[PDB]
Amino acid sequence: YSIEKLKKEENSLAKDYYIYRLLEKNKISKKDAQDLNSHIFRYIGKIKSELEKIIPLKPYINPKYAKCYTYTANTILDANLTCQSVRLNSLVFIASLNSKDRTTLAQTFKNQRPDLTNLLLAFNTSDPMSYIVQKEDINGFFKLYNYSKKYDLDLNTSLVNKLPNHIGFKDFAQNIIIKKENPKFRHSMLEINPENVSEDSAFYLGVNALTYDKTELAYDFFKKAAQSFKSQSNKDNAIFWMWLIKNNEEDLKTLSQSSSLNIYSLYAKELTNTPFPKIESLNPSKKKNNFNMQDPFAWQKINKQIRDANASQLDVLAKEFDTQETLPIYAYILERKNNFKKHYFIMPYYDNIKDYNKTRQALILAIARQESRFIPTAISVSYALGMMQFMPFLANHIGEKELKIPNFDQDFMFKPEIAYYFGNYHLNYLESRLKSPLFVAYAYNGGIGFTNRMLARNDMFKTGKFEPFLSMELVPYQESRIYGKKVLANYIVYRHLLNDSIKISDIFENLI
Numbered sequence: 001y002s003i004e005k006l007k008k009e010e011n012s013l014a015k016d017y018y019i020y021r022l023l024e025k026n027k028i029s030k031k032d033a034q035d036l037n038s039h040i041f042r043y044i045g046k047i048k049s050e051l052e053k054i055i056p057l058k059p060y061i062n063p064k065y066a067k068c069y070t071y072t073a074n075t076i077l078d079a080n081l082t083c084q085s086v087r088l089n090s091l092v093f094i095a096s097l098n099s100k101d102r103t104t105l106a107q108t109f110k111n112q113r114p115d116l117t118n119l120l121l122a123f124n125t126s127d128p129m130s131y132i133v134q135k136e137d138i139n140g141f142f143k144l145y146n147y148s149k150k151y152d153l154d155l156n157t158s159l160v161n162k163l164p165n166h167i168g169f170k171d172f173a174q175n176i177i178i179k180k181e182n183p184k185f186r187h188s189m190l191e192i193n194p195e196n197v198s199e200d201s202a203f204y205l206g207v208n209a210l211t212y213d214k215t216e217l218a219y220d221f222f223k224k225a226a227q228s229f230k231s232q233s234n235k236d237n238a239i240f241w242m243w244l245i246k247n248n249e250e251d252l253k254t255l256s257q258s259s260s261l262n263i264y265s266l267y268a269k270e271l272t273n274t275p276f277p278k279i280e281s282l283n284p285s286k287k288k289n290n291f292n293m294q295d296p297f298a299w300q301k302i303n304k305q306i307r308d309a310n311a312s313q314l315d316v317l318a319k320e321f322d323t324q325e326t327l328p329i330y331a332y333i334l335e336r337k338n339n340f341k342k343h344y345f346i347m348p349y350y351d352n353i354k355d356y357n358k359t360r361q362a363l364i365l366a367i368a369r370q371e372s373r374f375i376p377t378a379i380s381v382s383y384a385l386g387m388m389q390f391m392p393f394l395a396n397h398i399g400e401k402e403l404k405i406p407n408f409d410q411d412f413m414f415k416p417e418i419a420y421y422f423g424n425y426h427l428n429y430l431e432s433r434l435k436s437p438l439f440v441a442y443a444y445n446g447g448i449g450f451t452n453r454m455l456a457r458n459d460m461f462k463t464g465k466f467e468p469f470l471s472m473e474l475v476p477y478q479e480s481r482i483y484g485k486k487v488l489a490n491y492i493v494y495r496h497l498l499n500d501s502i503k504i505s506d507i508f509e510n511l512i
């Protein structure tokens, strides 16, 4: 596809992918590049670094404050008050000022902007965080945290209980707890009243409490999360923790009866001799329809229709895509049409994997379900490709260097045969070194590098009261933490459907 044919397609990640491929082959001239960010659906990361090597975008400072950005630290006292206040939005600018000028400006702004006064006079001390904490300036606290993570201080009960009301709190709490940073901040957050937090924040404050062996506090935080969380899957995770900590059989019972299929509800069902959840059976009789499952532009279009459709239109689309050839689209539509209440675990292009053993089949299918929902031309924001969502680098390494395939192109990852084949190959590499399917899952999403480093630590996937469940909450990247939980449920399910059951309790034992 030339840049001309692409310009005639709707903006989408598919079209971004293809523009990025031209850019990486140096086929975009400085003239082609003029109109080009109007042709880019998501102007972020690699495609933007690459376009900026050709046309280094100058903007953006706002026409209204242009004059304000002509001053420096040495001339800011000659700026009008509006300009003084705008420039003082940057803590780096504040840190750059000399101390006499911070004193002057602190007085100028006392009455009208005490927030600026506080930051100014704080940077006149050897510890700005300590000054801000003493004023209980909550906006200033978060501005300082975002300027530098290195500040760490004990916070009293009054202060920590004010932090949850600021939008910054959730990412702050998660980040320092998951990363095991800012120990004084962490310890201080034991005194947050569960009444003052909810959802993810409450959940992470329970994980925090467990790391200090404050099991009562933890229960209280987990219970608040269970009550406040929107998603049933997240409630179940919280209810599991309530059960593990205080051992109330009504918690486990409630969890065994969840409509969400996840590792926590699966596990609770197995502990209470409850039958395995019902898995829908999708068996369309029509073989084919018009739709090209190998056209990535067709997918991007129909996906947008599906996601924007009223209850009525979903039904017209359900009927149209009720074919074997478009089975992954059928399932995708049915998932949105039943408001995410039924369990779909399809097995498309099955011929390509039926000769592998059943455990490997289940892992492949588990990964595919999470990566793409089996959409052959799926493209991520990082331009990972096909059902098994291969990064192009790896796809080219395997296809050209290892398997010496004639005329290999990375777009071969859009072929099911190739996606499953490469997925098998890469899963052998990972499972050979890692063994557990949970660990394989982590390494598949976030690299074997990061997985090996996490498993090398003496406080991750070792023996303990609350292991391996606690470790699964402390996986340092949120995306990988979530990916692994989901892939593991998928694996259990597919093993079951393939008559190769395994007890999830055995999986958990093999994590220690």
Ligand SMILES: CC(=O)N[C@H]1[NH2+]C[C@H](C(=O)O)[C@H](O)[C@@H]1O
Pocket: 380, 382, 383, 384, 388, 389, 390, 391, 394, 426, 444, 445, 446, 447
């Ligand atoms: C096996 C494989 O290619 N893993 C990759 N899958 C897509 C991910 C993404 O962030 O989109 C990563 O590139 C991951 O390493």
